[PDB]
Amino acid sequence: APQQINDIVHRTITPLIEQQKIPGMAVAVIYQGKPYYFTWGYADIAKKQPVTQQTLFELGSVSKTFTGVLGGDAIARGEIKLSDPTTKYWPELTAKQWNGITLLHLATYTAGGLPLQVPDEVKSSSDLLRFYQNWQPAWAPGTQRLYAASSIGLFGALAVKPSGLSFEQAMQTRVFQPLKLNHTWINVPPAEEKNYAWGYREGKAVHVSPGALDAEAYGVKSTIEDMARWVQSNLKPLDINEKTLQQGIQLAQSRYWQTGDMYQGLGWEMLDWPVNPDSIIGDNKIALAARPVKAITPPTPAVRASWVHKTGATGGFGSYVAFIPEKELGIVMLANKNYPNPARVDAAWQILNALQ
Numbered sequence: 001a002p003q004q005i006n007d008i009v010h011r012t013i014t015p016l017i018e019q020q021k022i023p024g025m026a027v028a029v030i031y032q033g034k035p036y037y038f039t040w041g042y043a044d045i046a047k048k049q050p051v052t053q054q055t056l057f058e059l060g061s062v063s064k065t066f067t068g069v070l071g072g073d074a075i076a077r078g079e080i081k082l083s084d085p086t087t088k089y090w091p092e093l094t095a096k097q098w099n100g101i102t103l104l105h106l107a108t109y110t111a112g113g114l115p116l117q118v119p120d121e122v123k124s125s126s127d128l129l130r131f132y133q134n135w136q137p138a139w140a141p142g143t144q145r146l147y148a149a150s151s152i153g154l155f156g157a158l159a160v161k162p163s164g165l166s167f168e169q170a171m172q173t174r175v176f177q178p179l180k181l182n183h184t185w186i187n188v189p190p191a192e193e194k195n196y197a198w199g200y201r202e203g204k205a206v207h208v209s210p211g212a213l214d215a216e217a218y219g220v221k222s223t224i225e226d227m228a229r230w231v232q233s234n235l236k237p238l239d240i241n242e243k244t245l246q247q248g249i250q251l252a253q254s255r256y257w258q259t260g261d262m263y264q265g266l267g268w269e270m271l272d273w274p275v276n277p278d279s280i281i282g283d284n285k286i287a288l289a290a291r292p293v294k295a296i297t298p299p300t301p302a303v304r305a306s307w308v309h310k311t312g313a314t315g316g317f318g319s320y321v322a323f324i325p326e327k328e329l330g331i332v333m334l335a336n337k338n339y340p341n342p343a344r345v346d347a348a349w350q351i352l353n354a355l356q
């Protein structure tokens with residue numbers, strides 16, 4: 001990589017790894033549209049397997065960006081509309097509180113307080129139906145945002161109904177394949193198990209456990225090369241050949257709601273660029289932050305001068321993606337230890353600010 005890119009990347013990441021005691025990490029910086037990779041440490045400490053450009057990491061919540069784009073692609077295909085009520089795609093959802101709750105609300109965490117997580121006790125599709133039927137909104141739809149995997153997760157499951165494909169089949173055929181993300185998976189196959197890093201939590205090797213709507217909210221595993229291709233795709237949607245996918249990417253970056261300096265997209269979250277690092281560095285220390293939202297009516301189409309980003313974690317991994325369309329600049333950081341979000345954003349900001 002150009003020495004400048006090399007130098008900022010290393011002087012920022014080495015101290016981060018040391019301060020947070022991260023076992024393994026991979027970073028990609030997209031500069032003027034070209035990817036540069038860096039790797040440190042171990043994918044598997046016991047087996048002394050190093051992190052490489054082929055190592056798979058759990059993306060955790062960064063998976064929501066794929067769900068948002070897959071949903072955008074379904075809208076572009078005319079299979080669903082964000083303005084449709086949730087009950088159009090799940091008729092059995094006859095509980096009256098669902099009247100007025102649209103796919104837009106589900107996708108942007110504005111349905112009225114759906115929970116951060118689907119209860120672990122929900123193990124069957126029947127359990128799932130009961131869970132949503134019995135849920136009691138704390139607020140009217142479209143008035144407050146409460147980050148929720150049960151919200152965007154349900155959106156993903158419903159968005160693929162019209163197609164008749166399973167969520168995984170739809171993700172693979174409509175998003176992974178067209179973008180050539182050949183090393184990105186919802187279920188890691190046996191052929192790839194040797195590249196699947198272990199996550200580390202309190203010194204124990206761990207992999208994310210199965211759960212209701214896991215594919216839709218936190219189930220993707222990917223390599224640093226594929227994630228760099230994912231950022232390139234979202235940086236320049238106009239270069240994507242598949243029509244509906246190009247539109248779906250653009251739709252995921254439209255601004256649907258505003259809370260303070262942040263705007264909510266489908267999966268992606270955005271701030272205006274240039275951004276004050278404090279506005280973003282704007283943490284996982286709060287298990288629930290309910291925030292009033294202002295609807296952007298109609299939504300603002302994807303803005304190039306934005307800091308577009310998404311953080312994610314699983315018990316043993318921590319990831320972060322951020323890019324600036326206007327500068328053809330972006331970064332992906334994947335680690336096999338869940339460490340503080342503020343540290344991720346600060347590191348990413350130091351690197352991208354330096355390169356712009």
Ligand SMILES: *C(=O)[C@](NC(=O)[C@@H](C(=O)O)c1ccc(O)cc1)(OC)[C@@H]1N=C(C(=O)O)C(=C)CO1
Binds near residue numbers: 061149313
């Ligand atoms: C997304 O990262 C987030 N959490 C997860 O994806 C998983 C985790 O927090 O360990 C997870 C696994 C299994 C569940 O039933 C629930 C969650 O989505 C809920 C959320 N997001 C974060 C972020 O975006 O920074 C967090 C650090 C907290 O977890």
